[PDB]
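Researcher: Next entry: Haementhin (Scadoxus multiflorus).
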Amino acid sequence: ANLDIAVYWGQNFDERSLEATCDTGNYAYVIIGFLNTFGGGQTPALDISGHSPSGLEPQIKHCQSKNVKVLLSIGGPKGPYSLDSRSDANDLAVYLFNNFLLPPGHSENRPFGNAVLDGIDFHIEHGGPSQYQLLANILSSFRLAGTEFALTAAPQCVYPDPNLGTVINSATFDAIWVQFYNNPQCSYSSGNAEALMNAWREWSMKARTKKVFLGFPAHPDAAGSGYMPPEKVKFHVFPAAKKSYKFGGIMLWDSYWDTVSNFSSKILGEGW
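Model: Predicted structure:
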């Protein structure tokens, strides 16, 4: 099928390194997670499971030299993040732009050193719409001013998504990876993909984006529910998902678990 696979990285101190992840050759996008503290009077902080942020500079550059796009994900499954005021949204946009999306400015400092990331992933899991639209408006404005980067989003599988639905409706995202997991109403279950197929059909028809990816857990321990073996993804989902002009590929939660299960290796034949 010549499949693009996006994977989340950064969820365990003991995981395969960012550079070894890129060297597998299995992934088109690596999404580092997460900037999970911001808003409501806090300064921004990363929780990337104890990995050294400065130590990532050369690994990110290596990934990019092998044509792997590297994004930073904001929010995440847990964290004291919120964006309730217009001032929060402006502050966070300006911070992401200066520290991750532009070349170095020689005096204030950056998390990942002189690395320049390929975009920002909105993994907003609570708070509601809030000012996320304003945040996306401002980042989009920067994109139009010369800084070339992607904006992506990771909604849950019920359409419309309660946290990002209105932002997705603005068409601002270049790609979206729907999490087809942790909700039995819209993900695989019982050897019964009916709920999954119906949600895919809605998302692929209604989401205002050029590319929609299907997000799956890489291993049964990786999510509470929704694990679908790779043979069944290939046999059941691909023939239908390929009838869609919006089909982008799949996303896997997450690198740590994919190392263990070799899920991506199986989906691709072997992926070397």
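Model: Note for the record: The chain has one domain: 1-272.
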